[PDB]
Amino acid sequence: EDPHLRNRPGKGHNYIDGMTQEDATCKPVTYAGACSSFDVLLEKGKFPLFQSYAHHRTLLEAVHDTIIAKADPPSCDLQSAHGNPCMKEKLVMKTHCPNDYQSAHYLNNDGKMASVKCPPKYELTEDCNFCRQMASLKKGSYPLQDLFCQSSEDDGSKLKTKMKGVCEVGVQALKKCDGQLSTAHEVVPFAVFKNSKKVYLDKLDLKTEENLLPDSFVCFEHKGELKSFDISQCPKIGGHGSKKCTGDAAFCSAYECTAQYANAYCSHANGSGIVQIQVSGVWKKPLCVGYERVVVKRELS
Amino acid sequence: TSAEFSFVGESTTMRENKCFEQCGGWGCGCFNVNPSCLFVHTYLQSVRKEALRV
Amino acid sequence: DPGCSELIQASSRITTCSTEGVNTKCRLSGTALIRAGSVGAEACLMLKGVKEDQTKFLKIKTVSSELSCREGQSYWTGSFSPKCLSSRRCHLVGECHVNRCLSWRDNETSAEFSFVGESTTMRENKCFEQCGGWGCGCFNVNPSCLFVHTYLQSVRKEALRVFNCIDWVHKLTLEITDFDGSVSTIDLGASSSRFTNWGSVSLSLDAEGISGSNSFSFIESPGKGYAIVDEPFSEIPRQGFLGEIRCNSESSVLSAHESCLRAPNLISYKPMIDQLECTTNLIDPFVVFERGSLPQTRNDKTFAASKGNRGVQAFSKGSVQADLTLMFDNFEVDFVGAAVSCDAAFLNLTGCYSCNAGARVCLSITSTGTGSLSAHNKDGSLHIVLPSENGTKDQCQILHFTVPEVEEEFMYSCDGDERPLLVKGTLIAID
Amino acid sequence: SFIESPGKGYAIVDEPFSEIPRQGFLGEIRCNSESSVLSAHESCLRAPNLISYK
Numbered sequence: 072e073d074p075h076l077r078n079r080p081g082k083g084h085n086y087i088d089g090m091t092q093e094d095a096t097c098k099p100v101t102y103a104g105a106c107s108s109f110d111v112l113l114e115k116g117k118f119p120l121f122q123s124y125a126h127h128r129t130l131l132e133a134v135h136d137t138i139i140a141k142a143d144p145p146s147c148d149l150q151s152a153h154g155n156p157c158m159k160e161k162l163v164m165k166t167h168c169p170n171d172y173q174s175a176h177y178l179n180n181d182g183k184m185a186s187v188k189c190p191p192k193y194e195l196t197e198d199c200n201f202c203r204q205m206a207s208l209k210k211g212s213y214p215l216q217d218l219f220c221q222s223s224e225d226d227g228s229k230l231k232t233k234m235k236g237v238c239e240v241g242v243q244a245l246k247k248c249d250g251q252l253s254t255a256h257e258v259v260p261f262a263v264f265k266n267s268k269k270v271y272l273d274k275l276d277l278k279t280e281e282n283l284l285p286d287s288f289v290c291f292e293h294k295g296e297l298k299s300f301d302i303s304q305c306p307k308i309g310g311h312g313s314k315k316c317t318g319d320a321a322f323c324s325a326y327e328c329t330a331q332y333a334n335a336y337c338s339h340a341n342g343s344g345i346v347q348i349q350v351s352g353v354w355k356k357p358l359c360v361g362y363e364r365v366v367v368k369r370e371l372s
Numbered sequence: 373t374s375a376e377f378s379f380v381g382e383s384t385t386m387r388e389n390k391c392f393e394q395c396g397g398w399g400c401g402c403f404n405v406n407p408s409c410l411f412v413h414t415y416l417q418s419v420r421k422e423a424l425r426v
Numbered sequence: 427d428p429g430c431s432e433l434i435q436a437s438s439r440i441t442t443c444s445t446e447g448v449n450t451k452c453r454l455s456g457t458a459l460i461r462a463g464s465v466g467a468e469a470c471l472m473l474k475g476v477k478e479d480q481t482k483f484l485k486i487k488t489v490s491s492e493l494s495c496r497e498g499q500s501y502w503t504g505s506f507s508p509k510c511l512s513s514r515r516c517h518l519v520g521e522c523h524v525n526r527c528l529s530w531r532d533n534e535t536s537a538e539f540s541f542v543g544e545s546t547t548m549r550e551n552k553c554f555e556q557c558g559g560w561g562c563g564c565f566n567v568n569p570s571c572l573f574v575h576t577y578l579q580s581v582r583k584e585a586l587r588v589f590n591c592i593d594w595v596h597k598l599t600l601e602i603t604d605f606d607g608s609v610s611t612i613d614l615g616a617s618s619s620r621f622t623n624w625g626s627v628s629l630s631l632d633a634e635g636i637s638g639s640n641s642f643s644f645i646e647s648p649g650k651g652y653a654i655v656d657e658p659f660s661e662i663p664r665q666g667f668l669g670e671i672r673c674n675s676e677s678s679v680l681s682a683h684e685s686c687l688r689a690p691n692l693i694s695y696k697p698m699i700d701q702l703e704c705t706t707n708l709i710d711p712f713v714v715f716e717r718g719s720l721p722q723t724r725n726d727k728t729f730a731a732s733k734g735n736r737g738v739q740a741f742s743k744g745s746v747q748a749d750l751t752l753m754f755d756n757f758e759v760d761f762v763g764a765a766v767s768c769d770a771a772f773l774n775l776t777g778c779y780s781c782n783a784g785a786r787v788c789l790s791i792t793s794t795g796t797g798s799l800s801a802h803n804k805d806g807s808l809h810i811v812l813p814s815e816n817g818t819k820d821q822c823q824i825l826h827f828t829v830p831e832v833e834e835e836f837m838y839s840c841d842g843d844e845r846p847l848l849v850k851g852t853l854i855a856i857d
Numbered sequence: 858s859f860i861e862s863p864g865k866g867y868a869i870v871d872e873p874f875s876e877i878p879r880q881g882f883l884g885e886i887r888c889n890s891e892s893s894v895l896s897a898h899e900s901c902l903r904a905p906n907l908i909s910y911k
Contacts, residue, residue: 233623236756253397255405351623352610370756528889528900555890569892 073125073341076113077102078299080286081128084135085109085211089146089188090174092210107172107211118217120362123277125219126286126343130176130359133220134184139359142183146174149187149202157187160242161200164365165256166215168199174212175199178359180243182263186212218261218361221346225355227264232271234259239368240271251371259367262348262360275362276349279342283325287344290316290337300335377413387415429823430470430485431784432461433809440754443475450475450761454754459630462598462748463488464782467824469750472800472811473605479765479841481798482605483811486750489599490733493636493740494615495591495644499659501672502686504585504679505710508693510576512702513538517558517568527553527571539575548684549577554697562699572697576704578671578682585679586711587646588669590659591738594636598748599734602627605759613735614750624757630749634742636727643668644738645715648676652720652731652738663689668714745782768793768814768840770801775832775851777825783856784824787849792818793840801838801847814840827853863891880904 083099085108096104108131112121121129133139147157160179168175172195176186189195193202199215234240238248240259260275281287285303292300305326306312315329316322321339347354373382374389392410394400402408440456452475463469463486471484515522520537530553535542539551552574558564601611602622612620614629645653655668663670673679673686696703721730728741769792777785791799793814801810812821830853837844858875860868875884888894888901 235624235758255397524890524892524898525900528893555892569890 072122073343075126075289075341076122079128079132080126080289081132082135083132085129085131087131087146087174087176087184087186087212088141090210090212097211107209108176108214111169112214118214120217121219124343124346126340127346128220130178130184130214130216130218130220133359136220136222138220138222140183142179142181142185145184146186146188148190150190150193157185160185161187163239163242164215164363166199166364167197168195168213168215170194170196171206171208172199172213173202173208175215176212177215178218178261178263178269178361178363180269182267182269182359216361216363218359218363220359221356223265223356223358225265225357227270227350227355227357228267230264230267230270230351230355232268234271234273236370237367238370241269241363241365241367243269243271248368248370253369253371255367255369257367258362258364260360260362262350262357264355264357272348272350275360278347278349278354280345280347281340281342282344284344287340288318288322288325288337289340290318290322290335292335302337305337374411374413376411380413385415385417387413389413427786428466428468428487429786429821429825430483430811431463431467431824431826433470433472433811434460436471436473441473443759445476448763450477450480450763452476452759452761453756454624454759455756456754458752458754460486460750460752462486462600462746462750463824464746464784465491467782467784470811470823471752472798472809473759475759475761477842478800478839479797480761481800481811482759482761483603483798483813484605484752485603487601487603488746489601491633491742491744491746492597492599492733493594493634493727493742494597494735495639495738495740496593496595497589497737498592499661500587500589501669502585502587502675502679503669503672503711504580505582505712506578506671506682506706506708507581508576508704508706509579510574510693510695510702510704511539512572512574512700514556514563514570514572514700516564516570517566521573522571524555524568527555527573529553536573536575538573542575546681546684547577547579548682548686548688549575550693551575552695554695556697556699572699572702574695574697574702576693576695578688578693580680580682582680584648584650585676586715587648587676588643588655588711589646589738590643591639594639594740596629596632596635596748597739598629598746600627600750625753625755627753628751630751631747633747634744636740645711646736646738647715653715654718654720654722654724654729655714656718663687665689665692666709668709668711670709762797765797765841766793766795766814767843768797768799769845770799770838770840770847772847772849773820773822775849775853777853778856779827779830779832779853781856784826785851785853786824787822787851788820789822790818790820791815797840799838799840801836802844803834803836808834808836810836810838830854878902878904880907 079100085097085100085106086094093106097106100106100109112118128136134141147155149155149157173189174187179185189202192205192208194205194208195202238246238252259271261269261271263269288302290300290302292298304313305316308327315333316335316337317328317330317333318337322337345356347356348360390412392412394408394410396402396405396407436458440454443450443452460469460471465488467488469486472481474481515538530551532550535551554572554574556570556572558569559567564570595615597613597615599613601609603609604624610622614627616632617629619626619628641658643655643657643659645655657668660667663672671688678686693704693706721728730741732739771790773788773790775787791812791814794816797814799812799814810823833850836847836849838847858870858872878885878887886903893901
């Protein structure tokens with residue numbers, strides 16, 4: 072796993088439009104507070120994929136970092152009359168969530184940001200397919216998936232889902248099944264590339280490397296406990312900066328060795344920065360790869 | 373003793389109980405995708421009204 | 427130059443589809459049997475949708491007919507150099523005693539060499555009782571103690587992975603050219619299966635089979651050639667054998683990690699009061715590696731290196747007698763409404779008659795769009811399919827004949843209509 | 858088998874190397890160092906029940 076569980080690099084914002092009632096403890100996200108849209112992600116035996124890779128951003132954090140766009144509407148009303156857009160994309164997902172929740176965000180088909188919203192004070196059920204009337208209600212959303220956001224520049228629009236023998240997997244529809252149809256509860260991972268859709272894959276192959284971006288390096292200052300410090304202020308080789316910083320061979324090989332005039336002790340992350348996936352034989356870096364639990368409708372005829 | 377045969381009785385009869393695994397889904401008569409089971413309760417009974425002391 | 431040789435037509439039992447908005451989207455689901463080609467030839471497989479011009483190819487090229495050896499027992503070894511340290515301590519000083527130096531454990535550090543600390547490098551500690559008095563540098567008449575701290579370390583920059591072969595699996599490097607144009611190179615051994623983007627490929631029948639290889643071993647070098655050793659493998663590390671000091675990884679040999687194994691009582695010690703000399707008769711693996719390096723002539727076969735995956739292989743002198751089983755896991759094969767035209771030409775003819783190698787033909791195809799080009803003869807016994815691209819391209823597949831003077835007129839078709847084409851050439855005798 | 862003498866010449870014996878210090882054979886009392894033999898230390902190895910008593 073990763074030692075950095077509550078520490079979130081960069082902004083670390085976890086709030087959606089319409090449910091801005093937890094920004095006092097979830098903006099930013101630190102070791103203290105009580106964010107309902109982040110505490111359930113570190114639970115043992117629930118989302119191990121998030122516990123394996125925790126140095127990268129989440130879904131909402133990727134939305135606030137100008138990485139994942141927003142859908143229309145970004146937060147649909149799960150109680151409004153004359154139907155609602157967030158219905159067919161929710162009935163096809165077999166996920167569980169505790170009680171005292173009002174919102175439950177997930178991933179749509181265009182790779183944007185689609186979520187639901189429950190007017191106060193209406194809580195959800197065990198499956199979250201429908202809301203109901205009313206201890207304390209959570210002032211946030213519940214992640215229905217297990218994906219993490221990251222910055223990548225690898226195009227993959229032509230790498231559409233090629234799941235053979237499957238009519239409709241997850242939410243997307245490959246074709247119109249007119250004959251037989253086999254409905255079963257199977258788990259299938261997914262992956263989203265740049266300027267593409269929610270591509271589903273069979274097996275999942277991870278890859279951990281490093282680079283020269285400031286996100287792959289952490290640092291802390293020495294003062295009279297652990298105190299975080301902005302690592303982006305470290306000057307480059309022959310360039311400029313703000314506050315100096317030094318470290319070992321890994322941290323000194325990327326920035327400039329200062330030592331005597333440094334104000335903090337920079338270090339190297341525990342394998343983070345670039346996470347590539349093995350698809351079509353080659354290695355590409357996705358944007359929001361996950362491992363959800365939905366209903367797969369396979370063919371038969 | 374199977375759950376679908378406990379209402380019969382526990383009389384003194386040379387019987388046996390098995391459990392065969394079948395298929396699942398709506399292809400043969402089930403509402404779940406998990407493979408179903410088959411409860412077999414075969415007992416042995418006499419045929420002839422006389423015996424022999426071998 | 428490489429081309430298809432065994433061209434068979436797929437049956438209608440595993441071929442289906444329907445037209446939706448004028449778009450032939452055929453589907454393939456089932457198994458199919460096809461004969462693998464020889465060295466140089468390919469295994470073509472065309473598909474017939476609802477019309478005649480709608481035809482795509484599925485060729486499988488045979489690179490070579492090697493024999494992959496199954497690896498069983500493997501380890502890592504290499505050269506090393508003993509580095510012994512001497513530190514004589516007087517009697518009744520610290521850990522210097524007549525009973526604490528003679529029965530010293532070979533796995534515990536002393537107070538004289540405790541400044542190094544814990545390390546993952548292999549080492550050993552010995553105790554030797556020297557002399558005492560003022561004749562050698564002491565205050566008491568009791569003999570002093572000699573603490574020996576010898577650790578092993580390597581002086582080379584590379585290592586060798588000595589392994590053996592327990593079975594020779596008939597491996598065939600076969601590539602798969604999909605219907606769209608993507609080419610995926612895989613392999614098949616004995617009766618193994620793989621995973622592609624349209625089904626599963628497997629081998630039904632092997633070919634030949636070298637038996638008896640337990641009394642031989644091979645040497646693999648990272649980034650270099652291979653080698654062979656005419657000596658049976660030993661499971662226990664003994665002295666005088668190629669592998670008296672083994673490990674499990676290259677880093678465990680280049681740095682001499684403590685996880686490796688070695689033979690007991692191997693470092694010869696020569697204590698001389700204050701002098702220490704540790705000389706070991708280590709067997710240099712580079713002498714055998716440079717002595718018996720592949721290629722080597724062994725019986726009728728010829729052992730050589732690999733041409734793809736890391737592992738020992740073997741080159742044979744026979745033919746290719748194998749059958750390929752092509753499956754279909756419900757793959758979608760689309761088609762166009764109408765194919766484009768193309769005018770074929772003639773170039774040359776080089777090959778042989780009556781043999782497994784066949785004979786390649788030179789055909790100049792000049793078209794515009796992307797499609798295929800099906801050709802036929804005068805009696806429906808020779809089918810020729812070639813990809814159709816943009817511009818002028820030279821193609822041609824492997825053809826089989828029984829006459830050195832081939833003067834048969836062909837009828838090629840690119841979109842439905844046929845055009846006359848006459849070929850010629852001179853073939854040679856191929857055994 | 859060879860025998861080293863500190864200060865004098867060497868020697869050779871026409872027999873294999875002894876591995877068991879049995880009674881009635883050359884090599885029943887062994888030690889570890891020279892002082893363990895000259896001063897008769899208890900760290901050496903000897904055959905059990907070798908002292909005859911009358």
